Amino acid sequence: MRAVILVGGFGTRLRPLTLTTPKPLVPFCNKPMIIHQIEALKAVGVTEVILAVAYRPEAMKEQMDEWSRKLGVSFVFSVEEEPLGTAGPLALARDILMQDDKPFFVLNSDVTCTFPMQELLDFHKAHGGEGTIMVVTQWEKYGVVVYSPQNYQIERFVEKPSRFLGDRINAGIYIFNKSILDRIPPRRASIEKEIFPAMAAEGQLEGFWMDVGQPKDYILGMTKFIPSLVHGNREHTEAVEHQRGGRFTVIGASLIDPSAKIGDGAVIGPYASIGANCVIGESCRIDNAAILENSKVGKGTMVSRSIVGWNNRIGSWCHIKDISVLGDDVEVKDGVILIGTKVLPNKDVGEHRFEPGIIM
Amino acid sequence: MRAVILVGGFGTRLRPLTLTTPKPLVPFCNKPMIIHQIEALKAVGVTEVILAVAYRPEAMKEQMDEWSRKLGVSFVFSVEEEPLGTAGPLALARDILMQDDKPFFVLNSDVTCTFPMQELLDFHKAHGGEGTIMVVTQWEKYGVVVYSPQNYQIERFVEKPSRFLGDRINAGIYIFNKSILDRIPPRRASIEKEIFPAMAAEGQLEGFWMDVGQPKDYILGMTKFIPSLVHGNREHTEAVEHQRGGRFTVIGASLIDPSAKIGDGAVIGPYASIGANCVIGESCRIDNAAILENSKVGKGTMVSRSIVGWNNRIGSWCHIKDISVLGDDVEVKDGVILIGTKVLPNKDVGEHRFEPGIIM
Ligand SMILES: Nc1nc2c(ncn2[C@@H]2O[C@H](COP(=O)(O)OP(=O)(O)O[C@H]3O[C@H](CO)[C@@H](O)[C@H](O)[C@@H]3O)[C@@H](O)[C@H]2O)c(=O)[nH]1
Ligand SMILES: Nc1nc2c(ncn2[C@@H]2O[C@H](COP(=O)(O)OP(=O)(O)O[C@H]3O[C@H](CO)[C@@H](O)[C@H](O)[C@@H]3O)[C@@H](O)[C@H]2O)c(=O)[nH]1
Ligand SMILES: [Mg+2]
Ligand SMILES: [Mg+2]
């Protein structure tokens, strides 16, 4: 009946875009990352969502703007504990307890997946069935390796192993009972306080899954996510939007906000997202690139596999390719080629950069 | 009544384009380099032009194609003497003498200028007044430094001085009397056999001038030459051609052959030349670039300050910038960025190149 969406975190990996807005609130395709999870939780039977915000408590205004659909008015913060925020639910053990006794969800704010949230009870094992499903299944460099046999047990939990194999990792979605919040409230920073060795069956995905918290991970997660959204979002059959401005062609599926304007002959490539009020030039090429909001693009740029931040002003014949994240209010002069260079907010780029790097 | 246009030479400096056609026959703006000089000679009083062709005697067919206007049928070659071809006029001393006794012009085939060819006799000093006029006035690295006082005498003649100052250099256009061809015919290779120390008067440019024999020199000479052509060729007032295909905008003056096709929204930049039968994409940018013939360009490329050879097929969203000469029948894949890379004929480019170099 309640969920704990961990939103407090510096967002160091997605740095060029998180210098302006918290990582939960940077849009993924056309909505903020937390909004997808909040919509899934609205689909399942919960009403109140509590947020543990630490990095930037000024997300309250944006949440109130998005507060119309769901009652997510709850907001708690005293002092920076941890981006992982194990004490997050523990610091708010009183609110979860006295209102209701039902199990409470715990989710990361930078995770995208099918979001099952099944109405099936799954009362023999809470987190084992959900989160990382048992047949997740990717590189072991990031995320915790989970060793689970066919009988849904867990005995090992290593956050960042050096080389331990175990391609299965947690999806980042957890469901806990009221005993967990009362089990280990250490009152300080800790990492998820998983004491799974002690027990099995109590207390503690088939679909795409991606930890959308890094630029390349952002692009790959968008690539995996856009095809799965064709069933429900706006249902001219090549993509979600094919006629918004003039006459443009689309290759593959793409998400284009009806408020955007597209020039004559632009080629919106596979798995691309165009934000609200965005303007796209005559003969652009948006190949697996995300344009956030209010950005303007000249005639003939090819922004490919990169991210264009809010209120940008891209030049006329630029190349923004590889993994190059542009910050807020970044203006790029005509003919500038950016390849894997991250630009901090409020900068003007007039020089070419053929190697990965950072622009202050 | 006769002229000797030196056309025999390997064209090593303009190599990527001269591997297919001799340097005289590579088009400058819309016509071969020799054709401008032949037209100027036709403007002045002369009928027969003799060519000393060494590198490729296959230029005969193209000359016969251009033979309609002028009687340039003469062609002489026995064995490779020199690209400078001092023995050129000397090896054909019999034809110039017996036919006529009038002074004969001598020109380089890679020189562009105002081409005065004044009908004034200027018989007090033949080459002093013409060629390098005395007030040429450029770098001393290339060309011979000519030291001329206000009385029009030549004393020193050093082909490639190390550091001798003397910004004045010869224009490359010479006029000689019948004594020169009978003075020193050594029957072998030599360098212009200039014996100016012996004589001062009659023994033998106020305008733009450029030795168009190098890629960067080609671009700069085209830049200096197109504005001077606005008076004569085709006299919508921004450039020579402004409406040939769809609706495109032009910045500055440019030469576009009526046989070409231009897309909707292309921006033909300052001092650009488009060849016959060439096709330009929807939103290209032709900035100080020359398209030779039959080349096709996709939607949104920016070919800037570079040369695109015959029968090319440029990709859709390329960037051919800096001084990057493309050879005959070179195909470039979409999104390829070429910066100062010369491509030999009959090659396919699919990889980026951010540094000057050669593509085999
Ligand atoms: N940096 C950041 N982290 C946040 C934020 N909001 C919440 N977090 C939480 O910070 C935690 C760790 O930061 P991440 O970079 O997001 O996770 P990670 O360290 O790459 O790995 C963690 O997430 C995996 C999910 O893919 C999980 O394996 C597990 O949470 C792991 O500790 C996550 O649990 C996430 O909920 C934010 O705005 N910024
Ligand atoms: N390489 C080449 N040279 C040719 C060709 N046809 C004629 N030539 C003659 O080859 C001579 C020297 O080669 P260039 O590269 O054209 O001249 P340069 O060595 O840069 O300098 C010469 O030209 C200057 C005019 O700018 C003059 O200073 C003088 O001719 C000097 O030797 C020039 O006189 C030119 O007429 C050709 O197809 N290729
Ligand atoms: Mg994460
Ligand atoms: Mg020359």
Author numbering:
A (entry chain B), B (entry chain E): 9 to 143, 146 to 214, 220 to 250, 255 to 379
The study reports:
A prominent therapeutic target for antileishmanial drug development is leishmanial GDP-mannose pyrophosphorylase (GDP-MP or GMPP, EC 2.7.7.13), an enzyme catalyzing the formation of GDP-mannose by condensation of mannose-1-phosphate (Man-1-P) and GTP. As GDP-mannose serves as a central precursor for biosynthesis of diverse glycoconjugates necessary for host–parasite recognition and is essential for parasite survival, disruption of Leishmania GDP-MP activity leads to complete loss of virulence, suggesting this enzyme as an attractive target for development of new drugs against leishmaniasis. LdGDP-MP exhibits a hexameric structure with a molecular weight of ~245.3 kDa, consistent with previous observations. Each subunit is made of two separate domains, a N-terminal Rossmann-like fold commonly observed in nucleotidyltransferases and many other nucleotide-binding proteins, and a C-terminal left-handed β-helix domain containing tandem repeats of a [I/L/V]-G-X(4) hexapeptide motif, a characteristic structure found in the transferase hexapeptide repeat family.
To gain insights into the catalytic mechanism of leishmanial GDP-MP, we further solved the cryo-EM structures of LdGDP-MP in complex with its substrate, GTP, or the reaction product, GDP-mannose at the resolution of 3.0 Å, or 3.2 Å, respectively. These structures clearly mark a closed and well-ordered active pocket with approximate dimensions of 14 Å × 15 Å × 17 Å, delimited by β1–β4–β9 in the central β-sheets as the pocket base. Structural comparisons reveal that binding to GTP or GDP-mannose induces significant conformational changes primarily for the loop regions surrounding the active site, and results in an overall more compact conformation. Indeed, the key lysine residue (K170) in the F(V)EKP motif shifts ~5 Å or ~8 Å towards the catalytic center upon GTP or GDP-mannose binding. In the GDP-mannose-bound LdGDP-MP, the guanidine moiety, compared to that in the GTP-bound form, scrunches ~4 Å from the cleft end towards the catalysis center. In particular, the K170 side-chain in the F(V)EKP motif inserts deeply into the catalytic center to make close contact with the phosphate group next to the sugar moiety, indicative of its direct involvement in catalysis. The catalytically essential Mg2+ is coordinated by two absolutely conserved aspartate residues, D118 and D226.
